[PDB]
Amino acid sequence: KHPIIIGITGNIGSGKSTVAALLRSWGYPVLDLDALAARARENKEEELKRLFPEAVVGGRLDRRALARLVFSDPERLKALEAVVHPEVRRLLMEELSRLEAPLVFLEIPLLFEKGWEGRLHGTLLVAAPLEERVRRVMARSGLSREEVLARERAQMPEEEKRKRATWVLENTGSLEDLERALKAVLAELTG
């Protein structure tokens, strides 16, 4: 039958990574759109190598340049997303094509900001205090914190994501966490 597709999202340092690992550990398919975005980029490389010559160094599309370029003027960013998002979904359905579970999860960072809401059957928002999130990230790149605070402001604020998500998961001790995802997952009878 048709599996209910749920989008899992959260902000910088929310730990949604942990949430998905837990759903995989509990045996649910959890596709990573980030990885697809990548494979897609590699797939439609030629198309991109022509849309952004400035990023092609020695026959190779430099992922660095591409992003410094793409994120320099909106027009371009929008032109790149016009090739990747279609391919991203072509592959997302390929993947779904090999599944038979009645419930699938999708790690879509930038879920709301990039208009995925209307593409899912529901959205699981993983939230946490900003302070705990910032610290949690500083333990990854230890990037000034102040730098982080500026990346955090790069996405749709959490309060806003919170106002429009179907379910919301907080954060403290893995035990409570293990419970909440257990409660949300229950509203969708799947085991």
**Cα separation of 122 and 7, whole Å?**
6
Residue 177's domain spans which residues? 1-191
Contact 101, 4 (CB under 8 A): no
Q: Which two tokens stand for residue 22?
A: 């837990």
Number of structural domains in the chain:
1
List the CATH number of the domain containing 54. 3.40.50.300
Specify binding-site residues for ATP.
11-18, 140, 171
Q: Specify which residues 6 forms β-bridges with.
A: 105, 122
Give the determination technique. X-ray
Q: CA end-to-end span of the chain, whole Å?
A: 16
Q: Point out the annotated binding site.
A: 11-18, 140, 171
- For the chain, what's the residue count? 191
Q: Coil, strand, or helix at residue 24?
A: helix
How many beta carbons lie within 10 A of that of residue 51, not counting itself?
Answer: 18
CA distance 80 to 135: 33
